[PDB]
């Protein structure tokens, strides 16, 4: 069912995460972690303190899809482990230094064609698939986007609700 999902999304904040490769989204699903550039790390740390739930909605660049979404379970922390991120051009391990802990709510894909009807007021009402890494998605757009994903029956939202 969708009732516990809707409870988790209640009053959440939503952020578009753009990853330059699949390997790091795969690593994030396996390890329950995410790292981003400092400008976005600052925004997510602020949001984490301000909202009952901060949801990261993931999209690998050029995949034409979202790869799932997750809830921040911590602010960023340094020095816990050297997450073997696969680094593309220009990006280095010091920039991706802060690690957030995340609980996955859905590890299933959603193609961009399925969200064509959702626009993001905080990005000039462009289609929600359009946005830079770290772009905030307004509550109603973000809620409807998350509800479009296929249910992920491997995930029990009970423990997530307790983190709140
Ligand atoms: C592990 N975090 C990340 N990994 C890769 Cl390949 N790209 C990005 C971007 C564009 N923001 N955060 C990223």
Residue numbers in the entry: 344 to 507
Please give sentences taken from the publication describing this entry.
N6-Adenosine methylation (m6A) is a prevalent post-transcriptional modification of mRNA, with YTHDC1 being the reader protein responsible for recognizing this modification in the cell nucleus. The YTH family, comprising five proteins (YTHDC1, YTHDC2, and YTHDF1–3), is the best characterized family of m6A readers. Predominantly localized in the nucleus, YTHDC1 is responsible for the regulation of pre-mRNA splicing and mRNA export from the nucleus. In this study, we present a structure-based design campaign aimed at developing a potent and selective ligand of YTHDC1.
During the initial stages of the campaign, we identified that a chloride substituent located between N6 and N4 fits into the small pocket forming a halogen-hydrogen bond donor interaction with the side chain hydroxyl of Ser362 (C–Cl···H angle = 76°; Cl···O distance = 3.8 Å), which substantially improves the binding affinity. However, the adenine aromatic core cannot form a conventional hydrogen bond with Asp476, unlike pyrazolopyrimidine 1 moiety. Therefore, we decided to merge the two structural features and synthesize 5-chloropyrazolopyrimidine fragment. This compound exhibited improved potency together with ligand efficiency (IC50 = 2 μM, LE = 0.60) and submicromolar equilibrium dissociation constant (KD = 146 nM) measured by isothermal titration calorimetry (ITC). During the initial stages of the campaign focused on fragment optimization, we successfully developed a synthetic route to prepare compound 3. To synthesize chloropyrazolopyrimidine heterocycle 3, first, we performed a cyclization reaction of 41 by heating it in the presence of urea forming a condensed ring. The following deoxygenation and chlorination of the pyrimidine ring was achieved by POCl3. Finally, we carried out regioselective SNAr using an ethanolic solution of MeNH2 (33%), yielding the desired fragment 3 with an overall yield of 9%.
